[PDB]
Amino acid sequence: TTVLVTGGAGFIATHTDIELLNKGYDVISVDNYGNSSPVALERVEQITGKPVKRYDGDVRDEALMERVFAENNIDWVIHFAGLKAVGESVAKPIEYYDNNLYSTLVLLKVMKKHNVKKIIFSSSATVYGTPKELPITEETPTGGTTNPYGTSKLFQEQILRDVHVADPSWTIVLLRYFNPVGAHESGLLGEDPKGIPANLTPYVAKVAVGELKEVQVYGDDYDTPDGTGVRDYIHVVDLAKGHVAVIDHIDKEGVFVYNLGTGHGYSVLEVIKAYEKAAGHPIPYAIKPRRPGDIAACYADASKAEKELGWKAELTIDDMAASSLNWQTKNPNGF
Amino acid sequence: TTVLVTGGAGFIATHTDIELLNKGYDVISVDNYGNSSPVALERVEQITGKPVKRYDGDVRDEALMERVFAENNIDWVIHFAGLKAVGESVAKPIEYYDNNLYSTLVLLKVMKKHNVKKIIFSSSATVYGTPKELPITEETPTGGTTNPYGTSKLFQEQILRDVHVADPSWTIVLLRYFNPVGAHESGLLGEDPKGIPANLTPYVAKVAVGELKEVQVYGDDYDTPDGTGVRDYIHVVDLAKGHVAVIDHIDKEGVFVYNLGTGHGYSVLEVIKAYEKAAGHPIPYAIKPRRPGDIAACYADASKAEKELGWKAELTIDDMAASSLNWQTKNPNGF
Ligand SMILES: NC(=O)c1ccc[n+]([C@@H]2O[C@H](COP(=O)([O-])OP(=O)(O)OC[C@H]3O[C@@H](n4cnc5c(N)ncnc54)[C@H](O)[C@@H]3O)[C@@H](O)[C@H]2O)c1
Ligand SMILES: NC(=O)c1ccc[n+]([C@@H]2O[C@H](COP(=O)([O-])OP(=O)(O)OC[C@H]3O[C@@H](n4cnc5c(N)ncnc54)[C@H](O)[C@@H]3O)[C@@H](O)[C@H]2O)c1
Ligand SMILES: O=c1ccn([C@@H]2O[C@H](COP(=O)(O)OP(=O)(O)O[C@H]3O[C@H](CO)[C@@H](O)[C@H](O)[C@H]3O)[C@@H](O)[C@H]2O)c(=O)[nH]1
Ligand SMILES: O=c1ccn([C@@H]2O[C@H](COP(=O)(O)OP(=O)(O)O[C@H]3O[C@H](CO)[C@@H](O)[C@H](O)[C@H]3O)[C@@H](O)[C@H]2O)c(=O)[nH]1
C-alpha cells in the first residue's frame, strides 16, 4: 500500500511518515518547504531505515501533481499541505484561501483523473468555531469560524463531502486534529517551522533552551480558569498513529469524521509550567494582547475514534514537553 | 469611471454593460466564452453606440488579469464570471469550485496588487438555502446551501468579507440576485447560453418558437400551491440598472449586502402560462423528476435596495416573457 503525503516534510507529516513506514506502507512526499526542511525527510529515513520518495514543489502545480500520479501507483493520499496560523490568516486571507483551497482542488482533480479515491484530510478543531459544547464531539455543530484558516478548513470539508455526493465510491476521512505537540522519542526529528514559530510549544521550547527571549502569552482575559487560552494538546506521535489506524481499519466507501485529541485541556500558563518542569528552571513569559482569531477553549471527546479505530492518545503533557525539549536541546536551531 | 466586468459577455453582464455605457461609464470585458458569444459584445456596442474594450480569456489566468490591470485604470470591478447551474453543480462540484473560487481568488490577488478596492460580486438567493422565512431579507440567515453552486457563492461572500477585515479600505458589495429573465427592449441582445439552456426561461422561449420540443418541469411535489418550484423572477434590465445604482450611490468603504428581486414569486407552471400569453399558443410541457439541488420556494424583500439605492424592479412577468420572445423570435438560434 502506497501513501502520498502532501506537505510530507512538515511537523505532523514527518511523524506520520515514520509510523506509516514502520507499519510497512510505502510513502511518497510532496512539499514546497515553505514551513519545513528537506532534512526532515532525511531524518525520517534515518529513523526508519526506509525510503521516502521525495518530490519538491507545490500541490497547486498541476503538471507536478500529474507527474506524481503518472509515475506512482498511489492507494491513499494524506493531505497535510496547508498554511496553518489562525492569527496570520486574519491578516493574509487571500494567501490562506489560495494556498489551502486551491491545493485541495488541484489534488482532487488529479486524484479523480487517476481514479485514486481514498483521502485523509487534515482538518482542525477550528471548524467548530466557538464550541457549542465542551467536550467537543463529532455531533457538535460546525461553523461560526473565527478566522480564515478555520473557515478554509470547513470549506475544504464541504468540498470533499460534495466529491462523495458526486461519486460515492470515494472514501473521505475528515480528521479534526486538536493541538499536536512533541517529538519522536529519538530526538532526531521534531517541530521545525521556518521563521519565528507561530505555534505555542515550539516557541516555548526555544525560550527554554535560550534561542528566544520570552514567551508571548496572547491574552489573559478569556473565560477560562486562569484567563489564558485552553487547548487539547495531543502528542504528535499519538496523532501520527491515528493516521495508521484509519488506513488499517477503513477500507470502504463513505465520509468518516473523527476528532483526534486527548480530552485533556491545558491553559497556556499550564503548558509553560509543564515545560518548566521538563527543563528544571523558569521559562520567562509576558502577558500580551489577544491574537486575532483565537477562541477561549476547545478540547475533544475522542470516544468515536477509540470505538471505531481502536485508537487512543495517552501520551501526557509531560511526555509532550519532555520529547519537545529533547529534540530542541539536541537541535537548538532545528535543521 | 472605468468598470471591469468579468464574464462581461454573459447574460446579466451584457445588459449591465448597456446600462453602464448609457450612463457614461467606460466598460472593459473579460470572458472565456464558455457560456456566451463574442457577438453579444458587438450587440452591446450596436445598442449603445459605445465601445466595450474586449479581453478574451480566463479570469483564473493570472498573466491575463495582470495585463488587464496594467493596461487600464480600473475604478470598479463587477465579478459575473462563474458557472451557475444548481443541478450541474451537484454532478460537477470540482469544476464549480475550481472555476468559481479560483477565479475570485486570482481576481482579488491582482486587484490588491493594483490597489483597486471596489467590487460588486454577483451573489445569489441560493446562499439562503431552504429559506428560514419568506420573503427573504438581508437579515435572513445564510447557510444550509443545497448544492455546490450555492455553497460556492456563500464561500465567496465570506472570502470577500475577510478581504475587508484585513484591509477595511475596501468597498465590497454583495448583490444577491434572485432569478433574472428577459431581454433588452431592442431584441438585439438576450439570453444565449451554449448548449441546451439550463435555466427555465431560455428553454421555455425556445420551445415557444419551436427550437426545442417540450418544457421539462423538474418536480411537481414541492410544498408550493401547484407543486412546482417558486422563484422571484426579475427583469434582467431592472437587475442591470441595480448595478448602476450601486456604483452611482456607494462611494465609501465597507461591506454592503442587497437582495435584488421583485418580491413577486411565480411557479414554473405560471411562468409557462406567462409565455403562452406572450406567444398566443400553448407551449408543450411535461412533468419530470426533481432536479438535484432545487428548493421549493424563494423570493425577495428588496426594501433595503429601494431605501439605500433608490432602486426598484417593477418590470412585470409579462414584460419579461414578451421581451424574451421578442429576442428569441428575431434570433431563434441566438447568436
Ligand atoms: N496544531 C497543528 O499543528 C494542526 C492541527 C490541526 C490541523 N493541522 C493541519 O495539519 C496540516 C499539517 O500541519 P503541521 O503542523 O504539520 O504544519 P506544517 O507547516 O509543519 O506542515 C505543512 C506542510 O505543508 C507544506 N505546504 C504548505 N502549503 C503547500 C503547498 N501549497 N504545496 C506544497 N507544500 C505545502 C509546508 O511546507 C509544510 O511542510 C495542516 O493542513 C494544518 O492546517 C495542524
Ligand atoms: N439567475 C441568474 O442567471 C443568476 C442569479 C444569481 C446570480 N447569478 C450569477 O451572476 C453571474 C452571471 O450570471 P449569468 O446568468 O449572466 O450567466 P452567464 O453564464 O451568461 O454569464 C457568466 C459568464 O462568465 C463567463 N465565465 C465563466 N467562468 C469564467 C472564467 N473562469 N473566466 C472567464 N469567463 C468566465 C461565461 O463564459 C459567461 O459569459 C454568475 O456568477 C451567476 O452565478 C446568476
Ligand atoms: O506564542 C504563542 C502562541 C500561541 N499562544 C496561545 O496558545 C494556544 C495555542 O495556540 P497555537 O499553538 O497558535 O495553536 P491554535 O491557534 O489553537 O491552532 C493550532 O491548533 C488548531 C486545531 O486546534 C490547528 O488547526 C492550527 O493549525 C494550529 O496552528 C492559544 O490559546 C494561543 O492564544 C500563545 O499564548 N503564544
Ligand atoms: O428546464 C427547467 C429549468 C428549471 N426548472 C425549474 O424552474 C425554476 C428556476 O430554475 P432555474 O432557471 O434553473 O434557476 P434556479 O435554479 O432557481 O437558479 C437561478 O437563480 C439563482 C438565484 O435564485 C441563481 O444563483 C442561479 O445561477 C440561476 O441559475 C426552478 O424551480 C427549477 O426547478 C424547470 O422546471 N425546468
Residue numbers in the entry:
A (entry chain A), B (entry chain A): 2 to 336
Could you give the paper's own sentences about this structure?
GalE catalyzes NAD+-dependent oxidoreductive interconversion of gluco- and galacto-hexoses (C4-epimerization) linked to UDP and generally plays a key role in the metabolism of galactose in various organisms. Group 1 enzymes are further divided into two subfamilies (1a and 1b) due to their separation in the phylogenetic tree. bGalE catalyzes epimerization reactions of UDP-Gal into UDP-Glc and UDP-GalNAc into UDP-GlcNAc with the same level of activity and is categorized into group 215. The dimer interface consists of a bundle of 4 α-helices and contains 8 hydrogen bonds and 4 salt bridges. bGalE has a typical fold of SDR superfamily. The overall monomer protein structure can be roughly divided into an N-terminal NAD+ binding domain (N domain, residues 1–177 and 236–262) and a C-terminal UDP-sugar binding domain (C domain, residues 178–235 and 263–340).
Since the recombinant bGalE protein contains one NAD+ molecule per monomer as a noncovalently bound prosthetic group, we prepared ternary complex form crystals with UDP, UDP-Glc, or UDP-GlcNAc by cocrystallization and determined their crystal structures at 1.8–2.0 Å resolution. The electron densities of UDP, UDP-Glc, and UDP-GlcNAc were clearly observed. In bGalE, the UDP moiety is recognized by stacking and hydrophobic interactions by Tyr291 and Leu201, hydrogen bonds by Asp295 and Asn180, and salt bridges by Arg292 and Arg232. The hydroxy groups of the Glc moiety are recognized by hydrogen bonds from the main chain of Lys85 (O2 and O3) and the side chain atoms of Asn200 (O2), Tyr150 (O3 and O4), Ser125 (O4), and Asn180 (O6). In the UDP-GlcNAc complex, the side chain of Asn200 adopts a distinct conformation (designated as “swing out”) from that in the UDP-Glc complex (“swing in”) to accommodate the 2-N-acetyl group. The glucopyranose rings of the UDP-sugars in bGalE are both in the “standard” conformation, in which the H4 atom faces the pro-S side of the NAD+ nicotinamide. The distances between the C4 atom of the sugar ring and the C4 atom of the nicotinamide ring are 3.4 Å and 3.5 Å in the UDP-Glc and UDP-GlcNAc complex structures, respectively. Tyr150 forms a direct hydrogen bond (2.6 Å) with the O4 atom in both the UDP-Glc and UDP-GlcNAc complex structures. Lys154 contributes to the binding of nicotinamide ribose, while Ser125 and Tyr150 form direct hydrogen bonds with the O3 and O4 hydroxy groups of the Glc or GlcNAc, respectively.
